[PDB]
Amino acid sequence: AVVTAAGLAWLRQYLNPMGPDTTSVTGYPDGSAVTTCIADYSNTFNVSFPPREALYCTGSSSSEKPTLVDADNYAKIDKWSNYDITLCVLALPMLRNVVMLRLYPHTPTAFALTEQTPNFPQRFPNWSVYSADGTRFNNGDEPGYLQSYVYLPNVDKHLSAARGYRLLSRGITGIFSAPALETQGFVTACQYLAEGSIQSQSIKSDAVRSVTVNSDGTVKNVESSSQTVSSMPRYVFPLDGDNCAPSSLTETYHQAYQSKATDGFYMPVLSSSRDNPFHPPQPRAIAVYGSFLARGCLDPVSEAHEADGPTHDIYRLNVADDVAPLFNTGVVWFEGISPKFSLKLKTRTVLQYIPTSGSVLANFTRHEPTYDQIALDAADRLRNLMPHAYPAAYNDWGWLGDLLDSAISMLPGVGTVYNIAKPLIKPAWNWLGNKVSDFFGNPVARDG
Amino acid sequence: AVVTAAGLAWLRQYLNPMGPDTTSVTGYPDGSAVTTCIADYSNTFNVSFPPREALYCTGSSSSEKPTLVDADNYAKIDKWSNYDITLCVLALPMLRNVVMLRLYPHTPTAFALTEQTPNFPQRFPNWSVYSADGTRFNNGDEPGYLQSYVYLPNVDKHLSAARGYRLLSRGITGIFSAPALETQGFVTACQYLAEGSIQSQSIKSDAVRSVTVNSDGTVKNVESSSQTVSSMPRYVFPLDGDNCAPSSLTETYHQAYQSKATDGFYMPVLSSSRDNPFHPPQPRAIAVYGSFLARGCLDPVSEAHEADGPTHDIYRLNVADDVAPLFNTGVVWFEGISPKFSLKLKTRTVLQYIPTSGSVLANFTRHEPTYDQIALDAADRLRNLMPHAYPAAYNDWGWLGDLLDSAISMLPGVGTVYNIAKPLIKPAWNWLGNKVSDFFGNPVARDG
Amino acid sequence: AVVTAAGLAWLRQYLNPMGPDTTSVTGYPDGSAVTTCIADYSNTFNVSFPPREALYCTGSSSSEKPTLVDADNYAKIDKWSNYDITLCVLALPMLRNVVMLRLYPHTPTAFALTEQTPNFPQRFPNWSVYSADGTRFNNGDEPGYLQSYVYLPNVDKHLSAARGYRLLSRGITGIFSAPALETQGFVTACQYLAEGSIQSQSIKSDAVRSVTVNSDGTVKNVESSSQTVSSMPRYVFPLDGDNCAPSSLTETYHQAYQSKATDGFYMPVLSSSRDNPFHPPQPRAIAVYGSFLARGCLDPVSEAHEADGPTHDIYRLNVADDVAPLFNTGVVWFEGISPKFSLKLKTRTVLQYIPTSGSVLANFTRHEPTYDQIALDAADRLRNLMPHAYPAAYNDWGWLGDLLDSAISMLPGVGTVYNIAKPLIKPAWNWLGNKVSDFFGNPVARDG
Amino acid sequence: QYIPTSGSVLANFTRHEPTYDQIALDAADRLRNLMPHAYPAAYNDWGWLGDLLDSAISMLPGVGTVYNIAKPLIKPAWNWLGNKVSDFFGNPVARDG
Amino acid sequence: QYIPTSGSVLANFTRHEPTYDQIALDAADRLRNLMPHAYPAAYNDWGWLGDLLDSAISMLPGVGTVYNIAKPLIKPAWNWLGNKVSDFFGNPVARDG
Amino acid sequence: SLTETYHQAYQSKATDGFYMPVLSSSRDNPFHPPQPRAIAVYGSFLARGCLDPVSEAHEADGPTHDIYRLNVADDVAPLFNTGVVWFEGISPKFSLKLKTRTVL
């Protein structure tokens, strides 16, 4: 009839993963009564303009050969460094490869992605170059942008030796800095559910064509193996790549965060469902689900055009992972950034495991199978009204917890004992104008 | 603690889409806080016995050639027109292609469907003929029945330029008429959840068989490519085609509607779940999931029979669409109808969009992110006791809303303020006998 | 505001299927308002050490030929009968093939399973032999263990003629006996959710290699059909076969049941979710989802290694069924059993159907569409704290129902009228030590 | 009703509600002798049936009666041809329903 | 606003809220004649607008008035060049916002 | 089109007939002098003309709509609605008694 302490702690870490108060770590409030190990991964990366030595090419040049460093086309990228740039991070729900960084010479019209599968995508300290025309880059081309993945190795090691898993919470912080007189820029951030699924695209086999005109060999096997089959199953994400542009996100989502670049960002990525069931580790090739080109049987056609129906283009990422379902996909855009910037990324991912016997996790188990429905209902109610992001320095929210959670816990059904906790009003997060008010109208000091 | 006005309006349009009071249009009560555009499509079609000029054939005759009109086999169909006929409409949850009409010379034993993929299925003003033996019809055969799809083009155009969608409500009205002294007939209607899914049937590749008996060419590539792979993914509907016959539906479902033909029908198709999450547009080839023929590994067998396990026959419809999940499939049967009938179909589909930037929908957005749990709980409670269909002239239900919704909104949990609203009793919808009573025992005037 | 009688009866049969009081049969408390037929299958099997006449071999020997009896290698299995043995039952959620029995000469390190698809798996009265090295057994090999499936034929016949189904409850009882002075042994039991899914593994096609060196035939079709496609869809179960060993289950699950062998066991397998929606019959080849061997694109690689990513080994079972989703998988281990034992298995499966018209079920329909949310919430709350198994003779629990259900029904939300029912404490099920206490601290008489 | 044979199909659809009632059987005896032989096809859900007719008649059997008087019972007139039909308590019926 | 043509795109985005109001139209007439022609680009979300200006003016039309007095209305002085701007109720405005 | 566009639109079975009291669209009804003129129905334009960047040579042929002359002259009552009905699916041997009342 009242929220427990464990449920409240879980709610606090789920809504504010990077909060200074969230020192202890607690599991999902369903009391699964299973030996579980809750792991907390905190990582920091100082990303800046990459040097030439950590910059590989994805074209057919590095096809069978391992990664090829740029053959001193780095002059063009220095030319980029002359002017202002744009920096995007895409936080897909992938467990490892927490975020994908991308550097552009100037703001793109849309989040384009290469059709051909890239060669050797690079973990963060290295990058991989893509051409201006949306194609893989070989040496002697026109560089279009740089891309890299931020990889957590310990997450891989632990997901290896685990019977099941579920991601408890994840937050990303973006402490931004630049030399004085070069702080100009804007930061935009937005979350949105991009629910992927295990799908297989429709492909075609190759018909065999043999002409036996041997004197006694005249079989003439001309059979058509050119039928339609299914490619290997891949986890496809329906991220609206054509609408990941900054203005699109701003006008489409009203919880979208906007500020000057120096404020950084802080995205506590949130769920999109009520329940968080355990899942077995299941790494799969990730792909981004593009737009279809052949309508096919969307219009009156014959059987000959039955097969080539509405087949969407699939962009292979050449990256394999098991994703956390039902979590939002986040994305920011640091547009108009000085080239000699410095971004301190700080990611905190806390997630639960069912340890495998004899594995490492078996020595760090925790038996606190607490049950709580009030906390889950409150999480459902808040998910739909919490801001998408915050300034990087914004933590330890006074309204959070003793005020917001208490004021909202009275609403669920009539599971309420305290008559009234506190009236709740619509906040106004005008970070650009310094006219920000919290959920109870109390003005916030933008300095803190 | 009380249902809002927006939640009540949504409930009203969800339960009574064709209601005269439902003039305003409102979105789903979850307050998604996303720019949304709610579109209302109202369409009217005067379907009657088709003339010869709008009647194409689906056999191999129209395989590569476009649609072939019937080569004056129309004499047999006139022979149909001599006697009474039967008319079925199948309202699958497909977004476009709202319903599928079908004309039979006499009542079929079951909803048979052709095994071979038909050639050029026809939008409504045209029809396509199928043979009596359940096969595609070429000219010079025995016509078995006529089939057509009712297509909404604006729905296609809007679903093209939309990031996400969800179907808010859908209703179909069947105003029936016939010349005086020819009103004889019966109408049956029934809804039932036929939850389709993206599945791929198991098919076989073609083994290559080459006999190199050339003097120096003697490789003899005899490798068996005859392995088992997956066909292209299709959205399959498990509609019990063998049990879509009228009597089957009547005896199986107790909410099934029955009346004399002149009364028409009015089906407000209902959901089958609590939540209605947004989905990205995803047109796929629709198929109807038949019955399996080879048991395969359902019995002790070897590996040679491991592959050909329980593979069900799949009936390709040669029609592509993205379906609204979790909504019921409706079906009626106008049996014993005079051949020179006239049915005015009136479909109203209201559904929500997340507009794509620059698209048309972006100019017609609506920001009313209202939240309501009472309305959703009431919808869950009602879905399970609302009649499947109504007489065509039955609208503006007095019991609906101020009485039924109020009387039921007290039940959910104990989220109740008013002590008692009104006792609720089991209605008796005896439309044939003119002894109909509503949810509170008040007799209804069958005239209105 | 209070649990109904039908909801309470459903809860009782769901928690205690083999309870003597559960004579009447009741459906799921959601009031689906559909004609339903609830079927109860009670089966008894006296399993013992099989004789030579009912013992077939799974190797390539019985590949095209039907089952081959053992060619008097039965001497080795008699040698097994000299010493103590181990007996496992695996209760997967398969509707038919309720359990899978397995006999070992001595306790295995893990639940190994053959990589090659076995030949003709045997229904219970017959068994099938597997080699010691984890391979299929042909005559003249070293027998490793025996395996069989317990098959319910009536379930097959009824699932054939049914539009939809859902499994209401299932219980398995293990009355154990042995000659006097041979009762030594231990019994372990455990349930755990192993949520399977329809998956297709990634396989490769065979590239065609033709060398036309005919004088005029020099086409030289060398095209590579060796691409990557998807195998047929199979229902894969992620059962942690490497951790189905007894000690693993004991230390991993704290609700795991342990006792001396003579006590038998009684597993009321439980759900893992709140809702139990109807599903259409959908038999599929079952498979057990092993462990992957090729990391593939889990590490930086090229496109040539993109395809062969993290592909897990799949163990085909050569058995087809449609499984009940969201139910736990149970497993016991009778370790250190005398060879001349005798186990009376008693399985009770009660499950709901939507009858097909004209089918047999249509004559045994039941219209009691009762609705109850309190019962479902109570079931959710109990699922997480009920013991996994019981001694075979333990039924008719006093704490169950009038005490446990009443004491717990006050917790859900504040849907509570009676102020306090009874305090609830943590039970201690120390069946080995005869110090067992129920949910209210009342000591239980191990004799009853 | 059936008594299922073991192993037969009926054995999976059994029902244990062995309720006993003599009042219902006596009422059935009393009604059998005064119920109309047939009805118009559309005539169902009789208002007089059950809460009225069965209650009004259940007081008669012997003196197995608790409620003093339920409702007076009169002879109905089923003149379906003439549209002058009256039920067991004189209430005119709408031939449409 | 549009009156959609049948079958056209607008037909899928219609809105039925035929609200009637004469007070709003009269207030619009009264304000049109005294509202400033333009504003600084950053000037939005006027505090005086709506709850204050519209309320204070809605009492004037005829005597269609329930609230006795809302707020006295004075002539504003929009001296944007000199940073001496005052709104319709004399409250100085911060030129920064 | 009329049914879905107008919510005050009347629909019924044919036997019910109809009764349209055509209404004004304005507040005032000032007197006007008789002024018969050729009536025409204003169709849809075909030549965009200066709706797009063009020269003077295409300045003249701007957005000129097709006009359908009715070859009928009258003076119309301004500000009154235009009514329209449709008796669809009528038996050929029907009989419609029109009764018009105009007071002016």
Author numbering:
A (entry chain C), B (entry chain A), C (entry chain B): 66 to 513
D (entry chain A), E (entry chain B): 417 to 513
F (entry chain A): 313 to 416
Sentences from the study reporting this entry:
The models of T = 4 and T = 3 LSV2 VLPs were built and refined with the homo-trimeric subunits A/B/C or D/D/D. Each icosahedral asymmetric unit (iASU) of the T = 4 particle consists of four subunits A, B, C, and D, whereas one iASU of the T = 3 particle comprises A, B, and C subunits with the C/C dimer taking up a position similar to the C/D dimer of T = 4 particles. Accordingly, the T = 4 LSV2 VLP is an icosahedral symmetrical sphere consisting of 240 copies of the 57-kDa full-length CP with 80 apparent trimeric spikes on the VLP surface, whereas the T = 3 LSV2 VLP is composed of 180 copies with 60 trimeric spikes. Besides the overall differences in VLP diameters and CP numbers, the local difference in T = 4 and T = 3 architectures is that the icosahedral 2-fold (I2) axes in T = 4 particles exist between subunits B, C, and D in two sets in the quasi six-fold (Q6) arrangement but I2 axes in T = 3 particles are present along the C/C homo-dimeric capsomeres. As a result, the T = 4 and T = 3 particle sizes of LSV2 VLP are variable, with diameters ranging from 494 to 482 Å and 450 to 438 Å, respectively, from alkaline (pH 8.5) to acidic (pH 6.5) conditions. In comparison to the expanded T = 4 and T = 3 particles at the neutral or basic pH condition, measurements of diameters of the shaped holes on the I5 and I2 axes of the unexpanded particles at pH 6.5 show that the minimum and maximum displacements were changed from ~5 to 4 Å and from ~22 to 15.5 Å, respectively. At a neutral or basic pH environment, homo-trimeric subunits A/B/C rotate along I5 axes; homo-trimeric subunits D/D/D raise around I2 axes, leading the iASU to pivot upward. In contrast, the basis of the quaternary change on the T = 4 and T = 3 particles at acidic pH is further flattened on the I2 and I3 axes, respectively, suggesting flattened hexameric capsomeres concomitantly result in a compact particle.
